[PDB]
Amino acid sequence: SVQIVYKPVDLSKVTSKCGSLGNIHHKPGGGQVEVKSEKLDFKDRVQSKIGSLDNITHVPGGGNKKIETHKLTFR
Amino acid sequence: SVQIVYKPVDLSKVTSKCGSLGNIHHKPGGGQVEVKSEKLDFKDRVQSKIGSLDNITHVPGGGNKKIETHKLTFR
Amino acid sequence: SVQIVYKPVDLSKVTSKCGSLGNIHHKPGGGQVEVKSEKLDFKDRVQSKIGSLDNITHVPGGGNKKIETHKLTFR
Amino acid sequence: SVQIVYKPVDLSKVTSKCGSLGNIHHKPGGGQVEVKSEKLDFKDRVQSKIGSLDNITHVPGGGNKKIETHKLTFR
Amino acid sequence: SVQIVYKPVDLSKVTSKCGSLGNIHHKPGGGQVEVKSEKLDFKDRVQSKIGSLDNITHVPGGGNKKIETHKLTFR
Amino acid sequence: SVQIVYKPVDLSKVTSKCGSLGNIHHKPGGGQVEVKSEKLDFKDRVQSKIGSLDNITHVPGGGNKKIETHKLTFR
Structure with a gap:
C-alpha cells in the first residue's frame, strides 16, 4: 500500500x-526665492526647477515577487 | 492500493x-518666488517648473507578482 | 485501486x-509667484509649468499579476 | 469618525x-461451541447470546457539538 | 460618519x-454451534440469539450539532 | 477618530x-467451548454470553465540544 498526504x-x-x-511636517516654511538670469546662452537641453518649498516622493522600487511551486510525482 | 491526498x-x-x-502637513508655507529672465538664448529643449509650494508623489514601482504552480503527476 | 483527492x-x-x-494637508499656503520674461529666444520645444501650489500624484506602477497553474496528470 | 471591521x-x-x-482480521477462527442445558428454572428475564465468532461494534458516543457566537454591539 | 464592515x-x-x-475481514470462520435444551422452565421474557458468526454494528451516537449566531446591534 | 480591526x-x-x-489480528483461534448446565435455579434476571471468539468494541465516549464566543462592544 501507499498513502501520500500533502x-x-x-x-x-x-x-x-x-x-x-506616517511623517508629521508641523508648520514648515520655505524662504523667499529670487532668480535673476540675464544674457545666458544654452547650446543643449535645459531642465529646470525653481521653488520655495518642494516636497517630493519618488518610488521606482518597493515591488514584490512570490514564486511558489508545489510539484508532486508518483512513479 | 494507492491514496494521494493533496x-x-x-x-x-x-x-x-x-x-x-498617512502623513500630516500642518500649515506648510511656500515663500514668495520671483523669476526674472532677460535676453536668454536656448538652442535645444527647455523643460521648466516654477512654483512656491510643490507637493509631488511619483510611483513607477510598488507592483506585485505571484506565480503559483501546483502539479501532480501519477505514473 | 487508486484514489487521488485534490x-x-x-x-x-x-x-x-x-x-x-490618507494624508492630511491642513491649510497649506502657496506664496506669490511672479515670472517676468523679456527678449528670450527658444529654437526648440518649450515645456513649462507656473503655479503657486501644485499637488501632483502620478502612478505608472502599482499593478498586480497573479498566475496560478493547477495540473493533475494520470498515466 | 468610527470604522469597525469584523x-x-x-x-x-x-x-x-x-x-x-481500518483493522485487519486475517482468517480468524471461532472454535466449536456446545451448550447443553437440563432441568433449569428461571423465575425472571433471561437474556442470552450463544455463538462461535462474535464481532461487535457499539457506539453511543462520537457525537460533535460546535456552538459559535459572533456579537457586535454599537452604542 | 460610522462604517461597520461585517x-x-x-x-x-x-x-x-x-x-x-474500512476494516478487512479476510476469510473469517465461525465454528459449529450446538445448543441442546431439555426440561427448562422460564416464567418471564426470554431474549435469545444463537449463531456461528455474528457481525454487528450499532450506532445510537455519531450525531453532529452546529449552532451559529451572528448578531449586529446599532444604537 | 476610532478604527477597530477584528x-x-x-x-x-x-x-x-x-x-x-488500525489493529492487525493475524489468524487468531478461539478454542473449543463446552458448557453443561444441570438443575440450576435462578430467582432473578439472568444475562449470559457463551462463545469461542468474542471481538467487542464499545465507545460511549470520544465526543467533542467546541464553544467559541467573539464579542465586540463599542460604547
Missing part, C-alpha cells in the same frame, strides 16, 4: 512600505 | 504600500 | 496601495 | 472517528 | 465517522 | 480517535 499551510506575509509613511 | 492551504499576503501614506 | 484552498491576497493615501 | 476567519475541524476503523 | 469567513468542518469503517 | 484566524483541530483503530 498538507502544507502558508500564512506568510511578503510586504513593502516605501516612500514617505 | 490539501495545501494558502492564507499568504503579498502587499505593497508605496508613495506618500 | 483539494487545495486559497485565501491569499495580492494587494497594492500606491500614490498619496 | 473579519474573523475559521478553518477549524471538529472531528470524531469512533468504533472499529 | 465579513466573517467560515470553512470549518464538523464531522463524525462512527461504527465499522 | 481579524482573528482559526485553523485549530479538535479531534478524537476512539475504540479499535
Whole structure:
C-alpha cells in the first residue's frame, strides 16, 4: 500500500512600505526665492526647477515577487 | 492500493504600500518666488517648473507578482 | 485501486496601495509667484509649468499579476 | 469618525472517528461451541447470546457539538 | 460618519465517522454451534440469539450539532 | 477618530480517535467451548454470553465540544 498526504499551510506575509509613511511636517516654511538670469546662452537641453518649498516622493522600487511551486510525482 | 491526498492551504499576503501614506502637513508655507529672465538664448529643449509650494508623489514601482504552480503527476 | 483527492484552498491576497493615501494637508499656503520674461529666444520645444501650489500624484506602477497553474496528470 | 471591521476567519475541524476503523482480521477462527442445558428454572428475564465468532461494534458516543457566537454591539 | 464592515469567513468542518469503517475481514470462520435444551422452565421474557458468526454494528451516537449566531446591534 | 480591526484566524483541530483503530489480528483461534448446565435455579434476571471468539468494541465516549464566543462592544 501507499498513502501520500500533502498538507502544507502558508500564512506568510511578503510586504513593502516605501516612500514617505506616517511623517508629521508641523508648520514648515520655505524662504523667499529670487532668480535673476540675464544674457545666458544654452547650446543643449535645459531642465529646470525653481521653488520655495518642494516636497517630493519618488518610488521606482518597493515591488514584490512570490514564486511558489508545489510539484508532486508518483512513479 | 494507492491514496494521494493533496490539501495545501494558502492564507499568504503579498502587499505593497508605496508613495506618500498617512502623513500630516500642518500649515506648510511656500515663500514668495520671483523669476526674472532677460535676453536668454536656448538652442535645444527647455523643460521648466516654477512654483512656491510643490507637493509631488511619483510611483513607477510598488507592483506585485505571484506565480503559483501546483502539479501532480501519477505514473 | 487508486484514489487521488485534490483539494487545495486559497485565501491569499495580492494587494497594492500606491500614490498619496490618507494624508492630511491642513491649510497649506502657496506664496506669490511672479515670472517676468523679456527678449528670450527658444529654437526648440518649450515645456513649462507656473503655479503657486501644485499637488501632483502620478502612478505608472502599482499593478498586480497573479498566475496560478493547477495540473493533475494520470498515466 | 468610527470604522469597525469584523473579519474573523475559521478553518477549524471538529472531528470524531469512533468504533472499529481500518483493522485487519486475517482468517480468524471461532472454535466449536456446545451448550447443553437440563432441568433449569428461571423465575425472571433471561437474556442470552450463544455463538462461535462474535464481532461487535457499539457506539453511543462520537457525537460533535460546535456552538459559535459572533456579537457586535454599537452604542 | 460610522462604517461597520461585517465579513466573517467560515470553512470549518464538523464531522463524525462512527461504527465499522474500512476494516478487512479476510476469510473469517465461525465454528459449529450446538445448543441442546431439555426440561427448562422460564416464567418471564426470554431474549435469545444463537449463531456461528455474528457481525454487528450499532450506532445510537455519531450525531453532529452546529449552532451559529451572528448578531449586529446599532444604537 | 476610532478604527477597530477584528481579524482573528482559526485553523485549530479538535479531534478524537476512539475504540479499535488500525489493529492487525493475524489468524487468531478461539478454542473449543463446552458448557453443561444441570438443575440450576435462578430467582432473578439472568444475562449470559457463551462463545469461542468474542471481538467487542464499545465507545460511549470520544465526543467533542467546541464553544467559541467573539464579542465586540463599542460604547
